């Protein structure tokens, strides 16, 4: 018995060695970053020992494609810093992790993460300059040469009786190394909502519902318009368009009390380009001549035929007053107004590319990601420019999740029930399967799975078979195996779905093999809940159909929850 030990047990690697680990809670504050970036963090409570463990408090960065923090379910005892996309920091003896490697960069404090410290973080775009600070004291620059795919985000992960702080802006402390605060990318349309990081689950009111998996260098670049040839057939109509685009721009100003003046001054209400398309020369009138040529070139950029289909065809102002047409009565097509958004996008990205040189003007982003008010002035220039083409008669013509319950409850006898109350619609394959279903394949795409893509209405044994209905957001699906007469029934809010062959029984005349497992799927970004008894009153349509036909909920059996499985994105 001594001899069994020494040859086997101190070696520690032939047996399956084990150790308790605190449940790593991972987070993220909603906001992707891909310029030089910066954020801050203060600690409020730690409790460094409430277990027989130093309670962890890791701070760093991670990518979108990569870092799926399944809780403690990756490499050696899980957690933060474990990934090659993870670069964590902050602990008893502050130093970092990279692939969970506790390399030992020193500091002017060597102090534990306690209830007092202020963590100062940084990152650059295209420069991998990541180095953090405690209370604004340099911690000896660390991180270099890492790839950038997706957009990096703050992470902070920890587990004890902890409250801490971000500081994003509502700061308390901010030196400028690198620089831009993290409040700068709150802008686009999204508000901030801090979440639990990538989250196969979420804990809700009925029981826990299912989210999976996700949907993922923002530099503004226009498409080239100068390498596009306009024939002299179209140059004359373009100069007719440039003659129309100049005087409507003259009419666009003078409604606000403007007038012609040689001094180019906006406060004095005098502008040098309100006098005619002919009298302003071809560098002063080329603000309207070249912009109507490059618009019809950008029409030929996106693959559109801007050609002769029809023959080309009031407030008195203070210096020039013609009368072109009636333009907004002729209705633009949806392909034509989309090109007006394209002319708004292509021209503004030229200015965003030209202001790469020129710090950091607040509209230095692409046209799609900026706010909708700067989108109004760029579209209304190109929506009226689209009305000059239709007014003159020129037509413009333009992975997945797998869910299954506990294999012990691969039920084998009787009439059983569960339900699928469904929240968001998409690829939602719901049903039953034998335990031999490879989650490595897509769901329902074999002989061992009896599934039902709820939305799109098609049911799944060995591929397509249409059936039933497609559910609306907030419909209970309901699945009903009869183990005796080997049939399987579907409902939709307690309303039994008929075959396209003419019967209520969905999957009919299988054989009971090795039990059957309750099975659902998720597409790209869809949400669903699987309630398996436990609260028999919350079975919303088992009361209608069910109790009558003698079906069984799951947790009539149990007193515990059913711990399901999913195939990881990892």
């Amino acid at each position: 018995q001594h001899l069994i030990c020494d040859n086997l047990l101190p070696g520690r690697d032939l047996l399956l060695q084990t150790r308790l680990v605190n449940h790593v809670s991972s987070m993220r504050p909603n906001i992707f970053l891909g310029k030089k970036w910066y954020y801050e963090l203060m600690v409020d409570h730690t409790e460094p020992f409430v277990t027989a463990e130093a309670t962890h408090l890791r701070v760093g960065w991670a990518s979108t494609e990569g870092y799926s923090p399944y809780p403690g379910g990756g490499e050696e005892w899980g957690g933060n810093g474990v990934g090659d996309d993870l670069f964590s920091y902050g602990f008893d003896g502050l130093h970092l992790w990279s692939g969970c490697i506790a390399r030992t960069v020193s500091s002017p404090n060597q102090h534990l993460l306690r209830t007092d410290d202020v963590i100062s973080c940084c990152l650059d775009l295209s420069a991998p300059s990541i180095s953090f600070r405690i209370n604004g004291q340099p911690v000896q620059g660390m991180f270099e040469n890492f790839n950038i795919d997706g957009l990096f985000f703050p992470v902070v992960s920890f587990s004890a009786g902890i409250k801490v702080r971000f500081l994003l802006g509502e700061f308390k402390f901010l030196p400028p190394p690198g620089y831009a605060p993290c409040y700068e990318a709150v802008l686009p349309k999204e508000k901030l909502k801090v979440e639990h990081s990538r989250e196969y689950k979420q804990e809700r009111t009925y029981t826990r519902d299912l989210l999976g998996p996700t949907v993922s260098a923002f530099t503004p670049i226009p498409v080239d318009t100068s390498q596009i040839v306009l024939p002299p057939h179209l140059e004359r109509i373009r100069e007719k368009l440039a003659e129309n685009i100049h005087e409507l721009w003259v009419m666009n100003k003078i409604e606000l009390g403007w007038q012609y003046g040689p001094v180019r001054d906006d406060n004095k209400r005098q502008h040098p380009c309100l006098v005619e398309f002919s009298k302003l020369p071809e560098q002063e009138r080329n603000y309207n001549l070249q912009m109507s040529l490059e618009t019809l070139k950008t029409l030929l950029a996106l693959g559109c035929h801007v050609g002769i289909s029809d023959e080309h065809a009031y407030q008195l102002t203070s210096g020039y007053k013609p009368a072109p047409m009636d333009l907004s009565f002729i209705k633009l097509t949806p392909s034509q107004e989309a090109m007006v958004d394209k002319l708004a996008e292509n021209a503004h990205n030229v200015w965003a590319r030209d202001r790469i040189r020129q710090r950091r003007n607040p509209r230095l982003v692409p046209y799609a990601l900026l706010d909708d008010r700067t989108k109004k002035s760029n579209k209304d220039s190109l929506r009226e420019a689209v009305r000059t083409l239709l007014g003159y008669g020129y037509n413009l013509e333009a992975r997945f999740r797998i869910f299954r319950a506990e294999k012990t409850y691969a039920v084998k006898a009787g009439r059983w029930y569960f339900e699928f109350e469904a929240v968001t619609a998409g690829d939602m394959r719901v049903g039953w399967s034998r335990p031999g279903c490879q989650p490595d394949q897509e769901l329902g795409s074999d002989e061992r799975a009896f599934a039902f893509d709820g939305f799109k209405a098609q049911r799944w044994h060995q591929g397509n078979e249409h059936y039933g209905r497609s559910w609306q957001a907030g419909d209970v699906v309901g699945c009903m195996v009869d183990m005796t007469e080997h049939t399987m029934m579907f409902t939709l809010n307690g309303e039994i779905l008929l075959d396209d062959s003419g019967s209520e029984l969905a999957f009919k005349d299988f054989d009971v093999g090795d039990g059957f497992i309750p099975v659902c799927s998720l597409g790209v970004a869809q949400v669903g809940r699987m309630n398996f008894g436990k609260d028999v009153s919350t079975l919303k349509y088992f009361t209608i159909c069910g109790l009558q036909e003698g079906y069984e909920p799951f947790a009539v059996n149990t007193n515990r929850d059913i711990t399901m499985w999913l195939s990881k994105r990892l």
């Binding site: 390399r103 000896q140 660390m142 270099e144």
Partner: protein, 37 residues
């Protein structure tokens, strides 16, 4: 063992130290990992 990159590719990793400012403290490591032709 930490590798979850299911791509058809060359994708991936160096750490530096400091000496209270640095001044070198550069060379530590490279792997993540390895590629030939």
């Amino acid at each position: 063992s930490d590798f979850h990159q299911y791509d058809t590719a060359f994708d991936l990793v160096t750490v530096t130290l400091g000496d209270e400012k640095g001044k070198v403290h550069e060379s530590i490591k490279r792997s993540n990992y390895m590629v030939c032709a």
